[PDB]
Nucleic acid binder design. Structure first.
Ligand SMILES: *C[C@@](*)(O)[C@H](CCCNC(N)=[NH2+])NC(=O)[C@@H]1CCCN1C(=O)[C@H](N)Cc1ccccc1
Ligand SMILES: [K+]
Ligand code: NA
Lengths: 252, 27
DNA sequence: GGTTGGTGTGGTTGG
């Protein structure tokens, strides 16, 4: 996260860290959507151009964390994965279309003050919250700047959703309805972005109707980080909800 | 269930340091 | 240190 600030304790209790078993390495963020299911970006698991193809036994998740690297005794919980599900139409060849994956935990995680699921939006929440100029919130332990830098605790930044024509004109990569972009415009006089290492982490919005946090996006891609006239791109969660629901219904 | 309601915030009627900025953006 | 820094009559937690 570029130009964010340190999270408060418990501020993002659905935040999940995806960790490679060996070498030990932070891969990506992720989010907790129930006691057994974690959402992330597909490219965190599968990206052949970088020779990346992880299965369940390669990975673990760490939940309830605040420090990036210290094991937070009696606070964080570690979960093995039973199974990974990547969206079958995930396009890694071109533009990371449908950049979304589910990971089923081997055992339910016990909730705590530090560990709690975020809501997924329904059609009404998505219609009313996902509008240009409304701000959501992105969290992660990824780079603090483009490299050409790692934070000691979870970073947070709030960013406005951007009109689709503006997103589309900012880049030559093909944008689809499965994506949205967020970030300040060059002369808005505020800054901030997700960056490498933040993929899979949630873009969330707090509903003014019921006071709950909904995960509207997944950190997916960008070109550099926090550049003027560029925006961060996010997987559009509600657009892919039929697939999410299909996987949870069939495989839980 | 109680998805999206944080034990250390909404559940204790405490606001975090920057959520009002989100609320203001709807205005 | 440790599944882990830099300090705790801990901390988002023991000894
Ligand atoms: C894997 C994630 O950590 C990372 C998130 C980048 C977020 N950037 C900003 N400024 N908000 N995503 C990536 O690094 C993806 C994975 C493949 C390469 N990539 C990119 O973002 C490239 N920089 C652009 C791109 C290349 C190919 C296809 C789509 C986008
Ligand atoms: K200690
Ligand atoms: Na920008």
């Amino acid at each position: 996260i570029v130009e964010g600030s340190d999270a408060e304790i418990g501020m993002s209790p659905w935040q999940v860290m995806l960790f490679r078993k060996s070498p030990q390495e932070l891969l990506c963020g992720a989010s907790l959507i129930s006691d057994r299911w974690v959402l992330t970006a597909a490219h965190c698991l599968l990206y052949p151009p970088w020779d990346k193809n992880f299965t369940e036994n390669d990975l673990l998740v760490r939940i309830g964390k605040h420090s990036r690297t210290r094991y937070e005794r009696n606070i964080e919980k570690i979960s093995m994965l039973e199974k990974i599900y990547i969206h079958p139409r995930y396009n890694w060849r071109e533009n990371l279309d449908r950049d979304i994956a589910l990971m089923k935990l081997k055992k339910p995680v016990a909730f705590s003050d530090y560990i709690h699921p975020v809501c997924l939006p329904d059609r009404e929440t998505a219609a009313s919250l996902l509008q240009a100029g409304y701000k959501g919130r992105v969290t992660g332990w990824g780079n603090l700047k483009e490299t050409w830098g790692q934070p000691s605790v979870l970073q947070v930044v709030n960013l406005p959703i951007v009109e689709r024509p503006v997103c589309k004109d900012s880049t030559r990569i093909r944008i689809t309805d499965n994506m949205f972009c967020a970030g300040y415009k060059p002369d808005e006089g505020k800054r901030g972005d997700a960056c490498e290492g933040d993929s899979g982490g949630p873009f969330v919005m707090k509903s003014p109707f019921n006071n709950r946090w909904y995960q509207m996006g997944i950190v997916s891609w960008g070109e550099g980080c926090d550049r003027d006239g560029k925006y961060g791109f996010y997987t559009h969660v509600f657009r892919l909800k039929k697939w999410i629901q299909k996987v949870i219904d069939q495989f839980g | 269930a109680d998805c999206g309601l944080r034990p250390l915030f909404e559940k204790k009627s405490l606001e975090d340091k920057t959520e009002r900025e989100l609320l203001e953006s709807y205005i």
